Write a protein that binds this ligand. Structure first.
Ligand SMILES: */C=C/C1=C(C)C(=O)N/C1=C\C1=NC(=C\c2[nH]c(/C=C3\NC(=O)C(C=C)=C3C)c(C)c2CCC(=O)O)/C(CCC(=O)O)=C1C
Ligand SMILES: */C=C/C1=C(C)C(=O)N/C1=C\C1=NC(=C\c2[nH]c(/C=C3\NC(=O)C(C=C)=C3C)c(C)c2CCC(=O)O)/C(CCC(=O)O)=C1C
Lengths: 473, 448
């Protein structure tokens, strides 16, 4: 898995659709797109050292001098008197600059759909809304949204695509289809467009940082050359025009708007400017629906909680009370059974496994990770011998009642479900490395897996311990 | 009597635009007296011709618009419709900036900055409410030569009680000329619910003359605000200003608002990463005097041994332990309305959330005599109402000098810079102290 090793930020080339300049403080252009000879008469070794204004208009000269002042795109490079597009940044310690060819109606489209994501009630009503709008404005034949799992494997959770375009919906993808580095930068470079995938790269000459002992960091490059492997990837997939957007909830890369096209296709700055905003608007709503659900589960835990308050007020042992209310509260968070583990007293309510519940789970419990909690959807995975009791103990939820010794333990159990997940692949079949040739959906049925706990169910158990405590006074 | 003037059924609108009220299965009933003139109760299909009525009616019937400019809404059960006389990279690039802004101040002076470049307004100030709902202009972006109101406090009265629920529910407002002569609505009879015309989501609505009095005073004749909503509670306001009158068209004023929503989350971003950047430093010395209190044969010998340490945690002038039976004081002590007038003050309208206050003579008036030890107070419930054993830390009074736009004594006249020396006020709390306290009681609970 050298996938996580290939240095992608220094491809030593940019793409042909634009041309690029790297400049120091006083606009000595350091490096250059090797198609810049076709731009000012000067082959690259002659551009080097030269000053910036001469290249340019007198209009476009001054207007970049002022944008550089503040210690952010887009200026226009009309330079001589045609019109170019000026995206820039500072990086390393020199200023980069990439160049691109050439109101209201575009913009009403945006808020009509900004405000649409605002009304979306479910993630799915939101994401077939997200993906939909990204498509009505980037025109791509296919606009999919990709969820990341814990592993950084993924799943198409929504999709919007023009008819005749074959569908990759509900499909899982390996954690390898985006390796470590790509994610480390897509967390910080939130956007990428590659418009032709058999593009011939236009190198930069030189590949040297005059600033430091380095090749050219092309991190904040929208023009940077990408891996040939991810290209073989996309000829395989049969989509020759592609674009992504990183969807970030709080500096953890959450998922991706990956758009696709059968033929090549170009999105201008404004077009993918709006698009950054869509992933931004949606990273918001995902956090709202996330948190407005935590209040509607905190909602129906009302009627059934008050039940076991009257039941510990009357019985004055809680275990006798709560375990009476057991037939509903374990369906509340859809648990199969639970058990209460006091190191003196273990009382198992409903469905539960024996004597390695105690030691092999409570010594497994919090690790005195004070602010932490323990769970799995698979338990045969972590205590392999639980494989035997996987039928009643496949997944688990558990809550401490104290700084360890006291090691008071509550735990919810979930049984094994035969679920079917499907993917393109062959996630085992993932000289150089090589990308897959076929992406037809194969289905896997899963042994030993619980249904996924969500904070939605977690908030339930979370609330329970916080009341048992209130009563104990 | 400030919280009493009914502004929402003012029975009039502003002259620059004109508006009509119609009966829902569409026929038009009650008319604004600003529109009859240059163009009584009628049937409704009767609009421009089928183009702007029908395609626009079907869009409003089933589920903005262009006709003049056609904004609408449904309210107190009838159909509204307002009319006013008749870029994008800027908007996103300021989200993109509003997202990278590192501190609360860089969040607001970015906020303040775009809203100016998109209304051209002479002054775009950002106005945070403190708890009492007095306020302070915390950041500002402005055209030169125009007087600067930054770091300035204002009365809570400059926007009264009712006015606020409205900015809590109608999130935006513009009046372009403040000496508009109000052109009435006729009638101001709701034909549906038979009482005056609720003009709540009317953006053309006639505004209060009291606040008109305001802007002739201040000398700014073109103004617009946007209210900032963090979770259904009015947190603050983008108050924009202009020396002359000025109109911002509709799509132009939609962009202004969206910025405040971005900041309503962006502030919520800051709200929560300072909330965890403190719990760290934080643990390291805390966990120490937990084990030194966790020398519990029982706790006072444990706690009060290291209390002289845990007291330094929160600017604890004194604290108290309040169980209905056992009240234990660490440090400087208030005596008998500690028990009764604070723990009943505590969980009543507890609202599941805690009580903290900087002022006590304002919340229990007799605390005035004890300002030297009790001017501000914090308390945490142990939780059910009651026994509700409540712990509480307090703070003495600090002499700060606060600045105001003119004296805080009202009708108002002029708002030049004057100083008040503020007595009986304690110095504040944000969670590096509040989160401390929360974590602290969590410890005490884990203890018994
Ligand atoms: C082991 C090497 C790789 C395999 C196998 C593979 O599939 N990808 C490998 C490395 C890289 N991928 C790069 C970019 C990239 N990968 C994806 C993955 C998907 N694209 C899709 O459309 C879907 C699903 C519908 C998936 C799962 C994406 C989206 C991207 C970004 C570009 C785009 O939008 O298509 C990559 C980085 C190249 C670079 O930009 O430097 C590498 C190294
Ligand atoms: C208690 C009555 C009032 C006093 C006293 C007063 O000074 N004004 C009073 C009444 C109203 N104010 C209304 C709206 C309003 N008020 C403010 C106050 C400020 N403007 C500023 O620029 C700053 C600070 C820099 C402050 C504190 C604002 C911003 C607004 C909203 C409109 C605007 O942008 O100016 C108001 C409502 C009138 C209506 O809607 O009919 C009333 C009654």
């Amino acid at each position: 898995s050298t996938c996580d090793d290939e240095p992608i930020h220094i491809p030593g080339a940019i793409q042909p659709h634009g041309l690029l300049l790297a400049l120091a403080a006083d606009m000595t252009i350091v490096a250059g797109s090797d198609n810049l000879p076709e731009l000012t008469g000067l082959a690259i070794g002659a551009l080097i050292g030269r000053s910036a204004a001469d290249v340019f208009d007198s209009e476009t000269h001054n207007r970049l001098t002022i944008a550089l002042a503040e210690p952010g795109a887009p200026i226009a490079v009309g330079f001589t008197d045609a019109g170019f597009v000026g995206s820039w940044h500072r990086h390393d310690q020199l200023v980069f600059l990439e160049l691109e060819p050439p109101p209201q109606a575009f913009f009403r489209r945006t808020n009509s759909a900004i405000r649409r994501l605002q009304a979306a009630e479910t993630l799915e009503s939101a994401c077939a809304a997200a993906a939909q709008e990204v498509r009505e404005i980037t025109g791509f034949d296919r606009v999919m949204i990709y969820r990341f799992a814990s592993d950084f494997s993924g799943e198409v959770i929504a999709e919007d695509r023009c008819a005749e375009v074959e569908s990759y919906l509900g499909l899982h993808f390996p954690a390898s289809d985006i390796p470590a580095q790509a994610r480390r930068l897509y967390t910080i470079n939130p956007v990428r467009i590659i418009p032709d995938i058999n593009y011939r790269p236009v190198p930069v000459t030189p590949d040297l940082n005059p600033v430091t002992g380095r090749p050219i960091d092309l991190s904040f490059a929208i023009l940077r050359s990408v891996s040939p492997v991810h290209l073989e990837y996309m000829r395989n997939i049969g989509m020759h025009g592609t674009m992504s957007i990183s969807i970030l909830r709080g500096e953890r890369l959450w998922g991706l708007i990956a758009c696709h096209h059968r033929k090549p296709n170009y999105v201008d700055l404004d077009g993918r400017q709006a698009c950054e905003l869509v992933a931004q608007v949606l990273a918001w709503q995902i956090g709202v629906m996330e948190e407005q659900a935590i209040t509607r589960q905190t909602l129906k835990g009302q009627a059934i909680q008050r039940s076991l308050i009257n039941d510990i007020e009357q019985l004055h042992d809680h275990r006798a009370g709560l375990a009476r209310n057991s037939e509903a509260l374990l369906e509340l968070m859809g648990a199969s059974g639970l058990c209460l583990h006091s190191r003196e007293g273990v009382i198992t309510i409903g469905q539960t496994p024996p004597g390695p519940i105690i030691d092999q789970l409570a010594q497994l419990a919090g690790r005195s990770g004070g602010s932490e909690l323990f769970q799995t959807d698979r338990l045969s995975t972590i205590i392999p011998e639980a494989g035997a009791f996987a039928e009643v103990a496949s997944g688990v939820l558990a809550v401490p009642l104290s700084r360890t010794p006291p090691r008071r333990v509550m735990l919810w159990f979930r049984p094994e479900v035969a679920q079917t997940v499907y993917w393109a692949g062959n996630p085992d079949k993932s000289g150089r490395l090589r990308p897959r040739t076929s992406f037809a959906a194969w289905t896997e049925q899963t042994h030993g897996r619980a249904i996924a706990w969500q904070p939605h169910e977690v908030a339930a158990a979370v609330e329970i311990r916080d009341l048992i405590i209130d009563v104990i006074l």
